[PDB]
Scaffold this motif. Structure first.
Motif, PDB file in Angstrom:
ATOM      1  N   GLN A  50      40.633  37.948  35.886  1.00 17.07           N
ATOM      2  CA  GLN A  50      41.441  36.914  35.551  1.00 17.07           C
ATOM      3  C   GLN A  50      42.804  37.582  35.070  1.00 17.07           C
ATOM      4  O   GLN A  50      43.782  36.671  35.225  1.00 17.07           O
ATOM      5  CB  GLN A  50      40.836  35.657  34.465  1.00 17.07           C
ATOM      6  N   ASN A  51      43.035  38.457  34.413  1.00 20.37           N
ATOM      7  CA  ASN A  51      44.051  39.327  33.972  1.00 20.37           C
ATOM      8  C   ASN A  51      45.122  39.453  34.844  1.00 20.37           C
ATOM      9  O   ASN A  51      46.330  39.680  34.437  1.00 20.37           O
ATOM     10  CB  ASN A  51      43.713  40.275  32.880  1.00 20.37           C
ATOM     11  N   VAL A  52      44.748  39.604  36.142  1.00 16.86           N
ATOM     12  CA  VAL A  52      45.571  39.948  37.269  1.00 16.86           C
ATOM     13  C   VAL A  52      46.745  39.193  37.373  1.00 16.86           C
ATOM     14  O   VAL A  52      46.715  37.980  37.282  1.00 16.86           O
ATOM     15  CB  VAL A  52      44.876  40.123  38.561  1.00 16.86           C
ATOM     16  N   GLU A  53      47.913  39.479  37.617  1.00 15.90           N
ATOM     17  CA  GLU A  53      49.361  38.786  37.599  1.00 15.90           C
ATOM     18  C   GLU A  53      49.712  38.616  39.017  1.00 15.90           C
ATOM     19  O   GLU A  53      50.165  37.612  39.289  1.00 15.90           O
ATOM     20  CB  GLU A  53      50.424  39.524  36.851  1.00 15.90           C
ATOM     21  N   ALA A  74      36.977  26.250  39.820  1.00 11.61           N
ATOM     22  CA  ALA A  74      37.971  26.269  39.039  1.00 11.61           C
ATOM     23  C   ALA A  74      38.755  28.002  38.978  1.00 11.61           C
ATOM     24  O   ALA A  74      40.182  27.913  39.142  1.00 11.61           O
ATOM     25  CB  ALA A  74      37.289  26.363  37.400  1.00 11.61           C
ATOM     26  N   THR A  75      37.967  28.828  38.814  1.00  8.86           N
ATOM     27  CA  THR A  75      38.066  30.268  38.823  1.00  8.86           C
ATOM     28  C   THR A  75      39.246  30.845  39.857  1.00  8.86           C
ATOM     29  O   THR A  75      40.145  31.319  39.896  1.00  8.86           O
ATOM     30  CB  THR A  75      37.075  30.958  38.745  1.00  8.86           C
ATOM     31  N   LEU A  76      38.754  30.336  41.291  1.00  6.39           N
ATOM     32  CA  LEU A  76      39.581  30.605  42.402  1.00  6.39           C
ATOM     33  C   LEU A  76      41.036  29.712  42.596  1.00  6.39           C
ATOM     34  O   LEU A  76      41.856  30.657  42.699  1.00  6.39           O
ATOM     35  CB  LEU A  76      38.750  30.216  43.753  1.00  6.39           C
ATOM     36  N   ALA A  77      40.969  28.604  42.025  1.00  7.27           N
ATOM     37  CA  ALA A  77      42.267  28.009  41.980  1.00  7.27           C
ATOM     38  C   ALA A  77      43.271  28.718  41.290  1.00  7.27           C
ATOM     39  O   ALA A  77      44.262  28.859  41.465  1.00  7.27           O
ATOM     40  CB  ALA A  77      41.979  26.412  41.758  1.00  7.27           C
ATOM     41  N   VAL A  78      43.016  29.285  40.220  1.00  5.34           N
ATOM     42  CA  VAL A  78      43.790  30.053  39.194  1.00  5.34           C
ATOM     43  C   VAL A  78      44.231  31.394  39.885  1.00  5.34           C
ATOM     44  O   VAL A  78      45.403  31.827  39.880  1.00  5.34           O
ATOM     45  CB  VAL A  78      43.244  30.307  37.797  1.00  5.34           C
ATOM     46  N   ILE A  79      43.376  32.221  40.444  1.00  2.00           N
ATOM     47  CA  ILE A  79      43.554  33.537  40.986  1.00  2.00           C
ATOM     48  C   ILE A  79      44.457  33.396  42.232  1.00  2.00           C
ATOM     49  O   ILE A  79      45.337  34.122  42.491  1.00  2.00           O
ATOM     50  CB  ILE A  79      42.383  34.134  41.220  1.00  2.00           C
ATOM     51  N   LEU A  80      44.115  32.215  42.998  1.00  2.00           N
ATOM     52  CA  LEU A  80      45.006  31.941  44.247  1.00  2.00           C
ATOM     53  C   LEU A  80      46.213  31.648  44.039  1.00  2.00           C
ATOM     54  O   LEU A  80      47.222  31.854  44.867  1.00  2.00           O
ATOM     55  CB  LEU A  80      44.343  30.707  44.813  1.00  2.00           C
ATOM     56  N   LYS A  81      46.696  31.025  42.789  1.00  2.00           N
ATOM     57  CA  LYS A  81      48.277  30.734  42.543  1.00  2.00           C
ATOM     58  C   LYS A  81      49.050  32.305  42.534  1.00  2.00           C
ATOM     59  O   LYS A  81      50.132  32.238  42.376  1.00  2.00           O
ATOM     60  CB  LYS A  81      48.411  30.122  41.449  1.00  2.00           C
ATOM     61  N   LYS A  82      48.213  33.365  42.199  1.00  2.00           N
ATOM     62  CA  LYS A  82      48.759  34.565  41.959  1.00  2.00           C
ATOM     63  C   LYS A  82      48.975  35.382  43.402  1.00  2.00           C
ATOM     64  O   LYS A  82      49.408  36.558  43.429  1.00  2.00           O
ATOM     65  CB  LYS A  82      48.034  35.391  41.169  1.00  2.00           C
ATOM     66  N   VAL A  83      48.393  34.800  44.628  1.00  2.00           N
ATOM     67  CA  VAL A  83      48.466  35.581  45.802  1.00  2.00           C
ATOM     68  C   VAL A  83      49.682  35.171  46.594  1.00  2.00           C
ATOM     69  O   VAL A  83      50.366  34.024  46.571  1.00  2.00           O
ATOM     70  CB  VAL A  83      47.114  35.055  46.668  1.00  2.00           C
TER      71      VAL A  83
END
Length: 432
Positions: A50-53, A74-83
Motif C-alpha cells: 500500500q505504501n507505493v506512490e 477496496a485495496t485494488l481501487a486505492v492502488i489503481l489510482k497510483k497507476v
C-alpha cells in the motif's frame, strides 16, 4: 552485486529464488516503472505494498487489460489510482517484448530487474522463469559514463515519446549507475534512428574482443529460446543462429549468407559447436504440469520440414535437459528465459567468454539481420569476460544444482537430442 534468481511458481514450490511480491511488496518501494508484453492488472497490482506512490506502466495499446468491476475490491481501487499508463502504438507485425522493472525506494535507492515472465499469473507460474536483479543503485551525480546507463537511455529515447522522456528517462538520468560498470545493456528497437539488434550486438562483440588472438580451442555457441523462427530465405533453409549469427561471431562472414554444406565444413574445421535448447515432445510427459507450459514454446516446422531436419541432423544443433539433474518439483519443464552464450574450451559453459540474457527470441523480428532492422522492442543484459574488472571469465552455474555471475534454468551439461528418438515439440491445431 547483480544476481540471477529463479522465479517461484505456486505449483512447483508449494508449501536463490524470487517472487513478484519480493520485488514489488517491499514497504520502502516508492515508485515502479514497468515494461512488458502483457499485464494482468489484478494479478500484478496485488503484488504491491500500500505504501507505493506511483506505478508507471509501459505497454502496447490493448495489452493492459483493465480490472472489471466484479474483480475490484477496496485495496485494488486505492492502488489503481497510483497507476499511470503509457500506451504504445506499434507498427504492423511488431511487438513490445521488453520486460523491465525500474524501482525507486525511500532513501533514493534504485534497483533494476529483467524478469523473463510477462506480468500474468499463468506466465509467472507455468513455464520456468528467471529474473536478473541489478545491484543496488543510488540517486547521485555521475562520474565516468557507464555503458549500461548510456545504452539504457538510448533505448528509452528510441520510443520517441514525450511521456517516456519526461516520466521515465529523466528519473533514470538521476541515478548513478557505477555498480553496473562491468555490464552492457543490449536491446532491439524498431526506431530507424537508433542502431540495435543483431548488427549492434555484433559490432559490440567485435569491439569487446578486439586484439584477442585465434586458438585451436573448440568454440561453443549456445542459444536457449522459447521460439525458433523459420528460414531467413524462401528458397533455401537458413537458420538465424547457424547461418547468420554464429558465422558473424566466429568470423566466417563479415558485413560488407553461405551455402549450408560450406558452413558444415567451416564448423568442422574451426571446431564450432552450436546448441539450441528447446523442449522435446517427451519432456512434457516428465513435467509436473504436463503440457500446461507447452503453449509458450513455438517452433512451427511442419510446413517446411527440411529446415527442421537440417538443424536436427546436419548441424545436430538440438539439446535437451539432463533428466538425471533436474529437480523432482520442476522436472523437465522448459524455461521461457532467453540466453545466448559463448564458451571456448560436462564442464562446458561454467566459464564463458560472454553471455546475453534477454527477452529476444531466436527470430529475425526480434534481432533483425545485417540489412534489416528489428521489428520489436527487446532488452537484455550482456556479461562479457573482457568487461570484467579483473582479467577473468564470466562464471555460470545451473539452478538445478542449488556465487557465479550467471545462473541458468537448464541443466549443465545439456544433453544432445537422441537422433533415433527426440523431436522438438510442435503441435499444429485447427485454430492456428
Amino acid at each position: 552485486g547483480a544476481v540471477f534468481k529463479l522465479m517461484k511458481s505456486d505449483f512447483y514450490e508449494r508449501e536463490d529464488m524470487i517472487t513478484l511480491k519480493d520485488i514489488f511488496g517491499t514497504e520502502t518501494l516508492k515508485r515502479s516503472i514497468l515494461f512488458s508484453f502483457q499485464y494482468e492488472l489484478d494479478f500484478l497490482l496485488r503484488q504491491f505494498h500500500q505504501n507505493v506512490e506511483n506505478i508507471t506502466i509501459v505497454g502496447q495499446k490493448g495489452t493492459i487489460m483493465p480490472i472489471e468491476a466484479r474483480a475490484m475490491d477496496a485495496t485494488l481501487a486505492v492502488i489503481l489510482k497510483k497507476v499511470k499508463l503509457i500506451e504504445i502504438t506499434m507498427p504492423p507485425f511488431a511487438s513490445h517484448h521488453t520486460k523491465l522493472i525500474i524501482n525507486f525506494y525511500d532513501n533514493g535507492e534504485c534497483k533494476i530487474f529483467l524478469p523473463s515472465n510477462n506480468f500474468t499469473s499463468m506466465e509467472t507460474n507455468l513455464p520456468q522463469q528467471v529474473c536478473w536483479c541489478s545491484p543496488l543503485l543510488k540517486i547521485g551525480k555521475e562520474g565516468l559514463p557507464v555503458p549500461f546507463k548510456r545504452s539504457l537511455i538510448e533505448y528509452l529515447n528510441s520510443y520517441h515519446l514525450k511521456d517516456i522522456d519526461e516520466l521515465i528517462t529523466k528519473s533514470v538520468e538521476e541515478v548513478n549507475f557505477a555498480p553496473l560498470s562491468e555490464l552492457e545493456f543490449v536491446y532491439s528497437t524498431p526506431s530507424k534512428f537508433q542502431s540495435s539488434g543483431l548488427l549492434s550486438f555484433y559490432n559490440k562483440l567485435e569491439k569487446l574482443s578486439a586484439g584477442t588472438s585465434a586458438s585451436d580451442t573448440a568454440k561453443h555457441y549456445l542459444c536457449q529460446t522459447s521460439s525458433i523462427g523459420t528460414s531467413l530465405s524462401r528458397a533455401r533453409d537458413e537458420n538465424l543462429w547457424t547461418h547468420l549469427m554464429i558465422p558473424l561471431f566466429t568470423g566466417i562472414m563479415s558485413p560488407p549468407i553461405l551455402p549450408t554444406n560450406s558452413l558444415i565444413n567451416e564448423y568442422s574445421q574451426r571446431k564450432i559447436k552450436p546448441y539450441i535448447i528447446f523442449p522435446t515432445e517427451q519432456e512434457f510427459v516428465t513435467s509436473p504440469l504436463k503440457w500446461s507450459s507447452s503453449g509458450w514454446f513455438h517452433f512451427q516446422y511442419l510446413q517446411k520440414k527440411s529446415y527442421y531436419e537440417m538443424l536436427r541432423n546436419k548441424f545436430k544443433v538440438f539439446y535437451k535437459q539432463d533428466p538425471a539433474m533436474v529437480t523432482r518439483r520442476r522436472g523437465t519443464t522448459p524455461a521461457n528465459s532467453k540466453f545466448y552464450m559463448h564458451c571456448a574450451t560436462s564442464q562446458v559453459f561454467k566459464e564463458l567468454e560472454w553471455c546475453l540474457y534477454t527477452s529476444a527470441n531466436l527470430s529475425q523480428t526480434a534481432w533483425g539481420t545485417v540489412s534489416r532492422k528489428p521489428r520489436n522492442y527487446e532488452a537484455g543484459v550482456l556479461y562479457h569476460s573482457r568487461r570484467l574488472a579483473n582479467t577473468r571469465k564470466v562464471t555460470c552455474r545451473t539452478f538445478t544444482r542449488d556465487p557465479t555471475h550467471v545462473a541458468v534454468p537448464f541443466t549443465l551439461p545439456v544433453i544432445p537430442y537422441d537422433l533415433a528418438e527426440d523431436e522438438c515439440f510442435c503441435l499444429a491445431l485447427e485454430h492456428h
